Structure formats: structure tokens, C-alpha cells
């Protein structure tokens, strides 16, 4: 009931290990620990035979491009989570940071494996020949530009966009497409394991991000000002435009049976809005009813392909 006249912020350095000022951190690290997985657990022989014999060119190309798109984010040094303790110098945030950073290396190794297995290393090296990918790199570079900023307001902006776009949305259309092959045609089961496990991880990273944004809300409510909220709204809008066009490239050899572009676009718009609600920001798209239930099977399939 009694608010403190003064207190240390999330940006100040607590030196003693415990007790944790932000104990909820452990919900996120324990969820990752519990879901722990590596790609070496998985053999893709069945999936390659499925690919070889039973997928059309349109389908093969959807799989290939969805994986190139995931790899574009995942097969990289992703230094954000490893860097958060530099901004929030708490023992608990070193633990969250380190936990999510190690997870992202399990990710990079997993998608690197799928590229070698499916024979797409050449296409990955030249991926910047695709116009829409170069535009994805641009919107990603705008999210990431204030990642290492000493200016805390700007960094907070990077974090918001990092969490709602890169962790919560940018990959999820590709995840859905790959999962559709298993849900609707029983093919690519092992690939869908990797994807389901990554989906679970990325949701936890996004929610961890959201937790941190909400703590900054409480301590520095002045930060969520008019310009900043509008700066976020606009960047999101643009980003969704690029990811819609990513779909057009993924399905370049034609539309397929197991999933449709329009459903995916409303799936993305929807999950953006939900993430916005969760950090008390006004919705952008306001999707339906009943569009976004086209892909309401997503979570069920994710839960199912985690074994």
C-alpha cells in the first residue's frame, strides 16, 4: 500500500545475488529449462524421403523458402539477450539474458543443420539476392539500431520492437507453414518437431521481453509518451507489410493446399495486437471475428509436435 519515496531502478546495479528484486524472471528461465532440446536429438531421413517423393514443386519451394526465411533470423549471431545485463545490471537479468542467449545458439545450430540436410547452403549464402529479404534486413536493422544505446528511452524502444516483432511475429508465419505439412498431410514430422520447439522458445522470449517492458512501465511511466507509442505503431505497420511480401516470395511457385497467405497475414496482425494489449498499447489492426481462427490450430499443433 505505502509507496516508497525512493528506490533503485531496473537500470541500477544490485551487487548481492539474492533475494531477486525481479523473482518472476525464474518463470521464464524454468520454462526454457523444461523445454530444453537440441537438433542432434533428431533424424530427418523420413522427412527427406517425404520431400523427395511426395511434395510438389510448389510445396518444396514453400518449405525451402520458409526455412531460408527462418534461417535469415536464426542462423546469425543474435547478441540482444546476451547484452540485456549491460542495461539491467541485476543477477536475475544476467540469468535471463544467458538463458535466452544459449537458447538462440541451440536455434542457430538447429537451422544450420536443416540447411545442410536439405541442401540449401548455396541458396542461403546468396539470400540477399532476393529483394524482399533485403527489405526485411532493413526493417530488422531499424528494430536493432538502438540495441546497444546508452540512452535508456531509445533502448526501451529497441526492446519493445525486438519483443513484439522479432521474437513474437517475424518467424511465426514460417513456423505455421511448416507445421501445416504435418497437421494436414502427415509429412515433415521431424522438421515440425524442430519448428514446434523453436516456436515454444520464441514465445517465452517474447513474454520475457514483455515482462521487462511492463516493469519499465511501472518504474518510468513517463517513457510511454505520445511520440514513442506512435513511433512503435508505425514501425509495426511497415514490418507487417514486409512480412506479407515475404509470403509472396515463399509461395513464388504457387499457392498450396495446407495453408493460405490471407490466413497467415491475419494470424500475424492478430498476434501483434495481442502483444500490444499486453504492454498497454492501443491495437493497430482489430482483426475479426472470424478471420484469425483460420490458424487457431497453430498452438494445438505446436503443443502436439513437442511430443
Amino acid at each position: 500500500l505505502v509507496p516508497r519515496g525512493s528506490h533503485m531502478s531496473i537500470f541500477d546495479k544490485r551487487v548481492n545475488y539474492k533475494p531477486f528484486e525481479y523473482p518472476e524472471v525464474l518463470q521464464f528461465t524454468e520454462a526454457i529449462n523444461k523445454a530444453y532440446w537440441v537438433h542432434t536429438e533428431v533424424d530427418f531421413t523420413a522427412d527427406t524421403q517425404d520431400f523427395h517423393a511426395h511434395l510438389s514443386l510448389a510445396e518444396k519451394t514453400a518449405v525451402k523458402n520458409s526455412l531460408l526465411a527462418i534461417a535469415q533470423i536464426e542462423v546469425a549471431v543474435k547478441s540482444f539477450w546476451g547484452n540485456i545485463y549491460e542495461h539491467f545490471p541485476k543477477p536475475e537479468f544476467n540469468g535471463l539474458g544467458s538463458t535466452f542467449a544459449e537458447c538462440e545458439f541451440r536455434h542457430s545450430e538447429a537451422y544450420s543443420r536443416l540447411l545442410e540436410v536439405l541442401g540449401y547452403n548455396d541458396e542461403f549464402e546468396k539470400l540477399l539476392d532476393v529483394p524482399v529479404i533485403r527489405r526485411r534486413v532493413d526493417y530488422l536493422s531499424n528494430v536493432l539500431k538502438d540495441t546497444k544505446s546508452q540512452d535508456n528511452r531509445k533502448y526501451m524502444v529497441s526492446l519493445i520492437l525486438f519483443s513484439i516483432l522479432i521474437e513474437n511475429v517475424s518467424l511465426f508465419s514460417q513456423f505455421a507453414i511448416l507445421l501445416s505439412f504435418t497437421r494436414f498431410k502427415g509429412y515433415m514430422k521431424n522438421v515440425s518437431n524442430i519448428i514446434a520447439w523453436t516456436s515454444i522458445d520464441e514465445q517465452i522470449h517474447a513474454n520475457g521481453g514483455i515482462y521487462i517492458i511492463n516493469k519499465i512501465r511501472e518504474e518510468f511511466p513517463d517513457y510511454f509518451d505520445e511520440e514513442t507509442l506512435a513511433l512503435v505503431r508505425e514501425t509495426v505497420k511497415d514490418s507487417i507489410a514486409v512480412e506479407s511480401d515475404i509470403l509472396d516470395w515463399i509461395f513464388e511457385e504457387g499457392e498450396i493446399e495446407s495453408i493460405k497467405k490471407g490466413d497467415l497475414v491475419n494470424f500475424m496482425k492478430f498476434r501483434i495486437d495481442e502483444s500490444l494489449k499486453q504492454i498497454n498499447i492501443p491495437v493497430i489492426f482489430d482483426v475479426k471475428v472470424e478471420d484469425y481462427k483460420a490458424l487457431a490450430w497453430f498452438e494445438e499443433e505446436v503443443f502436439a509436435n513437442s511430443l
Partner: peptide, 6 residues
Amino acid sequence: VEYTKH
């Protein structure tokens, strides 16, 4: 700022 708290 560096500090302790229990």
C-alpha cells in the same frame, strides 16, 4: 549506481 539489498 552500485548497491546491496539483503
